[PDB]
């Protein structure tokens, strides 16, 4: 059971960084919710200023609401940027593990390729071809029909020609 | 930054180059061993005429 | 088998890249020579016009 001391140390560091980023993101989401609430209250106030007969106060409330929505937009974009940083941390971790796995596989396959090199396979296949040729030549030397034939017709098949003709006529 | 320095992009380039080279060598080795010229061995001197007529 | 065509393709692509880069370098050299000739003629002209 190998302990990966450095791996566990860096794991704790990355976990603490992710906790910090998640906490700040949660704070920003709470602030965004509060800003949305304030904007809604300002819109209600603007509606009451409109009903009461105070258009200047309605414009005041709508300007204040516009400021609150601009703050809400800035807060939401900051939270999205923090999410992007969190995703970058996780992507870097996954990519490091992928590169480690690929390097391990490359090491194994390199040891295999060095053991059984392509030149070795060329030598083996050349030996197989040469030996196949020699077996064929040896086994066709032993099967020459000139032995069991031995003595051949001096007339050059004329007697056997006439024998075949006579058997056919039979 | 610590992660990017550990697994640099040059390291990933080296790993992917090694994977490509080794894949090429496995393909060449495993196609060398599968040459049909062995099990075929002796080919028709008539160049498929007898097998043509057999078919 | 198919690896031979891949090797030929890789060599051809490498030669294409090198020749394209050499084409850019020859174009830049041509531009520099154009500028140098223009500059020599301009210098002779303004020395005709009296400034050193």
Coordinates of C-alpha atoms in Angstrom, one line a residue:
Chain A
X1 CA 0.0 0.0 0.0
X2 CA 2.0 2.9 -1.3
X3 CA 1.4 6.3 0.3
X4 CA 1.5 9.2 -2.2
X5 CA 2.6 11.9 0.2
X6 CA 2.9 14.7 -2.3
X7 CA -0.3 13.7 -4.0
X8 CA -2.2 13.9 -0.8
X9 CA -0.6 17.2 0.2
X10 CA -1.5 18.8 -3.2
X11 CA -5.0 17.3 -2.8
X12 CA -5.5 19.1 0.5
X13 CA -4.2 22.3 -1.0
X14 CA -6.6 22.1 -4.0
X15 CA -9.5 21.2 -1.7
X16 CA -8.8 24.3 0.4
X17 CA -8.7 26.5 -2.7
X18 CA -12.0 25.1 -3.9
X19 CA -13.5 25.7 -0.5
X20 CA -12.4 29.3 -0.6
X21 CA -13.8 29.9 -4.1
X22 CA -17.1 28.2 -3.2
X23 CA -17.5 30.3 -0.1
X24 CA -16.8 33.6 -1.9
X25 CA -19.3 32.5 -4.6
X26 CA -21.9 31.7 -2.0
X27 CA -21.4 35.2 -0.5
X28 CA -21.8 36.7 -3.9
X29 CA -25.0 34.8 -4.6
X30 CA -26.5 36.0 -1.3
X31 CA -25.5 39.6 -2.2
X32 CA -27.2 39.2 -5.5
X33 CA -30.4 37.9 -3.9
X34 CA -30.4 40.9 -1.5
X35 CA -29.9 43.3 -4.5
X36 CA -32.8 41.7 -6.3
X37 CA -35.0 42.2 -3.2
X38 CA -33.9 45.9 -3.0
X39 CA -34.7 46.4 -6.7
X40 CA -38.2 44.9 -6.2
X41 CA -38.8 47.3 -3.3
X42 CA -37.7 50.2 -5.4
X43 CA -40.1 49.2 -8.1
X44 CA -43.0 49.0 -5.6
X45 CA -42.0 52.5 -4.4
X46 CA -41.9 53.8 -7.9
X47 CA -45.4 52.4 -8.5
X48 CA -46.6 54.2 -5.3
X49 CA -45.0 57.5 -6.4
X50 CA -46.8 57.1 -9.7
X51 CA -50.2 56.5 -8.1
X52 CA -49.9 59.2 -5.4
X53 CA -49.3 61.9 -8.1
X54 CA -45.5 62.4 -7.8
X55 CA -43.7 61.8 -11.1
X56 CA -40.4 63.2 -9.8
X57 CA -40.4 60.7 -7.0
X58 CA -41.2 57.9 -9.5
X59 CA -38.2 59.0 -11.6
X60 CA -36.1 59.0 -8.4
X61 CA -37.1 55.5 -7.5
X62 CA -36.6 54.2 -11.0
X63 CA -33.1 55.7 -11.1
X64 CA -32.3 54.0 -7.7
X65 CA -33.7 50.8 -9.1
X66 CA -31.5 51.1 -12.2
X67 CA -28.4 51.5 -9.9
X68 CA -29.5 48.4 -8.0
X69 CA -29.9 46.3 -11.1
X70 CA -26.5 47.4 -12.4
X71 CA -25.0 46.2 -9.1
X72 CA -26.9 42.9 -9.5
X73 CA -25.5 42.4 -13.0
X74 CA -21.9 43.1 -11.8
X75 CA -22.3 40.7 -8.8
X76 CA -23.8 37.9 -11.1
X77 CA -20.9 38.3 -13.6
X78 CA -18.4 38.1 -10.7
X79 CA -20.0 34.9 -9.5
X80 CA -19.8 33.4 -13.0
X81 CA -16.1 34.3 -13.2
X82 CA -15.5 32.4 -9.9
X83 CA -17.4 29.4 -11.3
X84 CA -15.1 29.6 -14.4
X85 CA -12.0 29.5 -12.1
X86 CA -13.4 26.5 -10.2
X87 CA -14.0 24.7 -13.5
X88 CA -10.4 25.5 -14.5
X89 CA -9.1 23.9 -11.3
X90 CA -11.1 20.7 -11.9
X91 CA -10.2 20.6 -15.6
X92 CA -6.5 20.9 -14.7
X93 CA -6.8 18.0 -12.2
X94 CA -8.5 15.8 -14.7
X95 CA -6.0 16.6 -17.4
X96 CA -3.1 15.8 -15.1
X97 CA -4.6 12.4 -14.3
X98 CA -5.1 11.7 -18.0
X99 CA -1.5 12.6 -18.9
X100 CA -0.3 10.3 -16.1
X101 CA -2.3 7.4 -17.4
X102 CA -1.1 8.0 -20.9
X103 CA 2.5 8.1 -19.8
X104 CA 2.1 4.8 -17.9
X105 CA 0.6 3.1 -20.9
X106 CA 3.3 4.6 -23.1
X107 CA 6.0 3.2 -20.8
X108 CA 4.5 -0.3 -20.9
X109 CA 4.1 -0.3 -24.7
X110 CA 7.6 1.0 -25.1
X111 CA 9.0 -1.9 -23.1
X112 CA 7.0 -4.3 -25.2
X113 CA 8.1 -2.6 -28.5
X114 CA 11.8 -2.7 -27.4
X115 CA 11.5 -6.4 -26.5
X116 CA 9.8 -7.6 -29.7
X117 CA 11.3 -5.1 -32.1
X118 CA 10.1 -4.9 -35.8
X119 CA 13.6 -6.1 -36.9
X120 CA 13.1 -9.2 -34.8
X121 CA 9.7 -9.8 -36.5
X122 CA 11.4 -9.4 -39.9
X123 CA 14.0 -11.9 -39.0
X124 CA 11.4 -14.4 -37.8
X125 CA 9.3 -14.1 -40.9
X126 CA 12.4 -14.4 -43.2
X127 CA 13.4 -17.6 -41.4
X128 CA 9.8 -18.9 -41.8
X129 CA 9.9 -18.2 -45.5
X130 CA 13.3 -19.8 -46.0
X131 CA 12.4 -22.9 -44.1
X132 CA 9.1 -23.2 -46.0
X133 CA 11.0 -23.1 -49.2
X134 CA 13.5 -25.7 -48.0
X135 CA 10.7 -28.1 -46.9
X136 CA 8.9 -27.7 -50.2
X137 CA 12.1 -28.4 -52.1
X138 CA 13.0 -31.4 -49.9
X139 CA 9.4 -32.9 -50.1
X140 CA 9.2 -32.4 -53.9
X141 CA 12.7 -34.0 -54.4
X142 CA 11.3 -37.2 -52.8
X143 CA 8.2 -37.2 -55.0
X144 CA 9.8 -37.2 -58.4
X145 CA 7.7 -39.5 -60.6
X146 CA 10.8 -40.6 -62.6
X147 CA 11.4 -43.4 -60.1
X148 CA 8.2 -45.3 -60.0
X149 CA 8.0 -44.6 -63.8
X150 CA 11.7 -45.5 -64.1
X151 CA 11.9 -47.1 -67.5
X152 CA 10.0 -45.0 -70.0
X153 CA 8.7 -46.0 -73.4
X154 CA 11.4 -45.7 -76.1
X155 CA 8.5 -45.5 -78.5
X156 CA 7.3 -42.5 -76.4
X157 CA 3.8 -43.5 -75.4
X158 CA 2.9 -45.1 -78.8
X159 CA 2.3 -48.6 -77.3
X160 CA 0.2 -47.1 -74.4
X161 CA -1.6 -44.9 -77.0
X162 CA -2.6 -48.0 -78.9
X163 CA -3.5 -49.8 -75.7
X164 CA -5.8 -46.9 -74.7
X165 CA -7.3 -47.0 -78.2
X166 CA -7.9 -50.7 -78.0
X167 CA -9.5 -50.5 -74.5
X168 CA -11.7 -47.7 -75.8
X169 CA -12.8 -49.9 -78.7
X170 CA -13.4 -52.6 -76.2
Chain B
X1 CA -0.2 27.6 -11.8
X2 CA 1.3 24.8 -9.8
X3 CA -0.7 22.2 -11.9
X4 CA 0.2 23.9 -15.2
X5 CA 3.9 23.9 -14.3
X6 CA 3.8 20.2 -13.3
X7 CA 2.0 18.9 -16.4
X8 CA 3.3 21.5 -18.9
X9 CA 2.0 21.6 -22.5
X10 CA 5.4 20.4 -23.8
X11 CA 5.0 17.3 -21.6
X12 CA 1.6 16.6 -23.2
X13 CA 3.1 17.1 -26.7
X14 CA 5.9 14.6 -25.8
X15 CA 3.4 12.1 -24.5
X16 CA 1.1 12.3 -27.5
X17 CA 4.0 12.1 -29.9
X18 CA 5.2 8.9 -28.1
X19 CA 1.7 7.4 -28.3
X20 CA 1.5 8.1 -32.1
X21 CA 5.0 6.6 -32.7
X22 CA 4.2 3.5 -30.7
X23 CA 0.9 3.1 -32.4
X24 CA 2.6 3.2 -35.8
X25 CA 5.2 0.6 -34.6
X26 CA 2.5 -1.7 -33.3
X27 CA 0.6 -1.4 -36.6
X28 CA 3.7 -2.2 -38.7
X29 CA 4.7 -5.1 -36.5
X30 CA 1.2 -6.6 -36.5
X31 CA 0.8 -6.2 -40.2
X32 CA 4.3 -7.7 -40.9
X33 CA 3.1 -10.9 -39.1
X34 CA -0.1 -11.1 -41.2
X35 CA 1.3 -11.0 -44.7
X36 CA -0.8 -13.5 -46.8
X37 CA 2.2 -14.5 -48.8
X38 CA 3.0 -17.2 -46.3
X39 CA -0.2 -19.2 -46.1
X40 CA -0.6 -18.6 -49.9
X41 CA 3.1 -19.4 -50.3
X42 CA 3.2 -21.0 -53.8
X43 CA 1.1 -19.0 -56.2
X44 CA -0.3 -20.1 -59.5
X45 CA 2.2 -19.8 -62.3
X46 CA -0.8 -19.6 -64.7
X47 CA -1.9 -16.6 -62.5
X48 CA -5.4 -17.8 -61.3
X49 CA -6.4 -19.4 -64.6
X50 CA -6.8 -22.8 -63.0
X51 CA -8.8 -21.3 -60.1
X52 CA -10.8 -19.2 -62.6
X53 CA -11.8 -22.4 -64.5
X54 CA -12.5 -24.1 -61.2
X55 CA -14.9 -21.3 -60.1
Chain C
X1 CA 0.3 -1.8 -45.7
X2 CA -1.6 1.4 -45.2
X3 CA 1.3 2.8 -43.0
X4 CA 3.4 3.4 -46.1
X5 CA 0.9 5.8 -47.6
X6 CA 0.8 7.6 -44.2
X7 CA 4.5 7.9 -44.2
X8 CA 4.5 9.3 -47.7
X9 CA 1.8 11.8 -46.7
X10 CA 3.8 12.9 -43.7
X11 CA 6.9 13.5 -45.7
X12 CA 5.0 15.4 -48.4
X13 CA 3.3 17.6 -45.8
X14 CA 6.6 18.4 -44.1
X15 CA 8.1 19.3 -47.4
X16 CA 5.0 21.5 -48.2
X17 CA 5.3 23.3 -44.9
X18 CA 9.1 23.9 -45.4
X19 CA 8.6 25.2 -48.9
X20 CA 5.7 27.5 -47.9
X21 CA 7.9 29.0 -45.2
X22 CA 10.7 29.4 -47.7
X23 CA 8.2 31.2 -50.0
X24 CA 7.3 33.7 -47.2
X25 CA 11.0 34.3 -46.6
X26 CA 11.7 34.8 -50.3
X27 CA 8.8 37.2 -50.5
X28 CA 10.2 39.2 -47.6
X29 CA 13.6 39.2 -49.2
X30 CA 12.1 40.5 -52.4
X31 CA 10.3 43.3 -50.5
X32 CA 13.6 44.2 -48.7
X33 CA 15.5 44.4 -52.1
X34 CA 12.7 46.6 -53.5
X35 CA 13.0 49.0 -50.6
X36 CA 16.8 49.0 -50.8
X37 CA 16.7 49.9 -54.5
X38 CA 14.1 52.6 -53.9
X39 CA 16.3 53.9 -51.1
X40 CA 19.5 54.0 -53.2
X41 CA 17.7 55.9 -56.0
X42 CA 16.1 58.3 -53.4
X43 CA 19.5 59.0 -51.9
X44 CA 21.1 59.7 -55.2
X45 CA 18.2 62.0 -56.1
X46 CA 18.4 64.0 -52.9
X47 CA 22.2 64.3 -53.2
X48 CA 21.3 65.8 -56.6
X49 CA 19.1 68.1 -54.6
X50 CA 21.9 69.0 -52.2
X51 CA 21.7 67.3 -48.7
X52 CA 24.2 65.1 -47.0

